[PDB]
From a paper:
Tryptophan is frequently found on the surface of membrane-associated proteins that interact with the lipid membrane. Here, we describe the use of racemic protein crystallography to probe dedicated tryptophan interactions of a model tryptophan-rich bacteriocin aureocin A53 (AucA) by inclusion and/or exclusion of potential ligands. When proteins of natural L-chirality are introduced with their synthetic D-enantiomers, they can form centrosymmetric crystals in achiral space groups with high dimensionality, thereby enabling structures solved at a high resolution over wide-ranging conditions. Finally, in complementation to recent studies, this work illustrates racemic protein crystallography is an effective approach to elucidate tryptophan interactions of membrane-associating proteins.
Testing if the insights obtained from the study of AucA can be transferred to improve our understanding of other bacteriocins, we prepared a distant homolog, lacticin Q (LnqQ), for analysis (48% homology). A synthetic scheme based on chemical ligation was developed and the structure of LnqQ was solved by racemic protein crystallography (0.96 Å). However, LnqQ lacks the corresponding W3 residue and, as anticipated, was found to be monomeric: sharing essentially the same retention time as that of AucA-W3L in the SEC analysis. Indeed, the monomeric L-LnqQ appeared to be more sensitive to proteolytic degradation, as its enantiomeric D-counterpart is resistant to proteolytic degradation and is significantly more potent leading up to 16-fold of difference in activity. Furthermore, W41, which is equivalent to W40 in AucA, is anticipated to be most crucial for activity, and its replacement by a leucine residue nearly demolished all LnqQ’s antibacterial activity likely due to a lack of H-bond donation. For other tryptophan residues including W21, W23 and W32, their replacement resulted in a greater loss in LnqQ’s antibacterial activity, when compared to those of AucA. A plausible explanation is that the LnqQ is more sensitive to residue substitutions because of its monomeric nature, and so for future work the biophysical properties of LnqQ will be investigated. The involving residues, particularly W40 and Lys44, are highly conserved, with presence in lacticin Q25, lacticin Z40 and epidermicin NI0141.
Author numbering: 1 to 53
């Protein structure tokens, strides 16, 4: 869970709703990281889902 919590910690700068989405989608995030997706790629993907631009 080291990559997952790095994702959540990087999202915390963006606020509670970003952290909220990450916890509810923990399995997606774990699956992306295990599929070879980088932590920074996952943070960007989540920001795109949230509409942070």
């Amino acid at each position: 869970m080291a990559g997952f919590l790095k994702v959540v910690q990087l999202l915390a700068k963006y606020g509670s709703k970003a952290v909220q989405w990450a916890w509810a989608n923990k399995g997606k995030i774990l699956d992306w990281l295990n599929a070879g997706q980088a932590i920074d790629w996952v943070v960007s993907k989540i920001k795109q889902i949230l509409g942070i631009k």
